[PDB]
Symmetry: D2
Subunit: 170 residues, 4 copies
């Protein structure tokens, strides 16, 4: 019932920088499924695909929120077409989160990380995964906030086990 | 694999004009589930609630597309928040349909029936259910269209069995 | 500084069915402008263009709200891009109206007429112009409403002078 | 003809951190007007209000894109309502830019700066103005980019005169 949104790099699953993140992505997906959480993501490839595969492997449900004319990775329990472009799709995606977990990522993920914060959604950065997940950590205010209104705390975990632990810890 | 979107009256399920449409709404929901169709709707009460109940009763899956960050009826297999208002939520809803079935409805259903057509989605009106479902049938061009560009045909069915039959006939 | 939104036929501005409305459109435009009203429209062609042209010819201002990335007729004082499809662009357009004036139109216009009503915006149908403007008048509840919640009245005018008169009367 | 979008802090114009930025905001607005650029902004208070005052003071035109059915600051040449929340309103705001100039700002401005980049819109950070405009400069890839696809360059200027100079330099 608790909903967690996962964001990260897009692009081919079999090539860098998402290929080096396979085990972490699959572990994250399976663990969320095992814990009974409903998983949401941007529905494309990359990290999104791998986490989905992991959730389905464990029999969990994963819902994809898709931009305009996209099909969705083959592991989606439900593929939701929006008709919206990438960025706006992301904001409707964020609305479905109780918590957001970030992995690597380029500009799209950065917008989602910042958006999750503006909407008061707790964010858990899975450190060591590169991209903006690690980059955004270098500009935190008081090591926990993305702006001076300290809307919600940005959390940091170096391990999937540490991540879920934080989700449970609210 | 096939996605059917159902639209209709909102409002309390236990009062008119939606109460009179209980059996048809439950029949519709169960039959869609039994046939293996994935059901989508506006997620609120009224016809939306009863069709969902019917889908869940038969073990089918029903997904709700919600306006803003609402809650949606208790029978949704998956509730999707959008942060969008009623009318725009309706257009991300229509993007998820292979076919739209209409039951009664007020202005919101009308906008959806019209919206469906503009997006080239076949619409099946379930006649005798009142509201705009019956009202829109009195202005069809050549009895099948909503505008001179004849984008897609507006089908009519006086029975749930007659409705699904039309879907199958595609 | 009353904001009036005008909606109607899109398409070649020199051919049927919009060429015949050439005068009522240009005239509504100039009149709206001479009365000091600020005008908004879907910024494309058809009725939308002539009313734009009529507003500039009389030296007023006409703001167009564009679907996604289209150009907008050459008379727009300001061309606002949205990144939204045709139907959603229409709803941001409607938010800018104190009153909506309808001329001819196909499905896009029908959706706008119905949407204006759902948002609570008084609509003035300029009768005899055809399209959905005349078609929608045949299904009015009590001859003034579009649904049983009687959100706001739908006014009818057979003349530009009659139309503005209604706008002044509020 | 050339459209520049300016983003920055919101909040009361008479208090920190926006009051300290009065002169720069007014100079930016006046200079844009004098050079003949069409100015767009989020339409609220704060930096948006001051830049607008500056544009109107010099007789230029400034258009506001408002979240929801907001009112807008009293210097807007045209106020455009959208019925969209803050973030999405920002994305339709960004579609109206040939270039984006940033001043101070909290999370909203950060999302706009990142969004601008994802859309291929050159951004000019007006340094020394604090907030995210300065903070985002500490995480540039190769001193110019916001992600490894290097979509478009993020320029930096320490003076209004320097800023407009960069815009002219295309």
């Amino acid at each position: 019932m608790k909903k967690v949104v996962v964001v990260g790099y897009s692009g081919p699953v079999n090539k860098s920088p998402v290929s080096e993140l396979r085990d972490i992505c699959l572990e994250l997906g399976r663990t969320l499924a095992k814990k009974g959480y409903l998983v949401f993501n941007g529905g494309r490839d990359g990290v999104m695909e791998l986490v989905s595969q992991g959730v389905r492997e464990a029999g969990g449900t994963v819902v994809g929120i898709l931009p305009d004319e996209e099909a969705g990775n083959p592991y989606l329990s439900v593929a939701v077409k929006t008709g919206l472009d990438f960025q706006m799709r992301s904001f409707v995606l964020l609305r479905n989160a109780d918590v957001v977990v970030s992995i690597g990522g380029e500009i799209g993920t950065a917008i989602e990380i910042l958006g999750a914060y503006a909407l008061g959604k707790p964010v858990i950065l899975l450190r060591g995964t590169g991209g903006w997940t690690d980059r955004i950590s270098q500009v935190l205010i008081d090591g926990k906030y993305l702006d001076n209104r300290r809307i919600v705390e940005i959390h940091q975990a170096w391990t999937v086990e540490e991540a879920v632990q934080i989700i449970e810890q609210i």
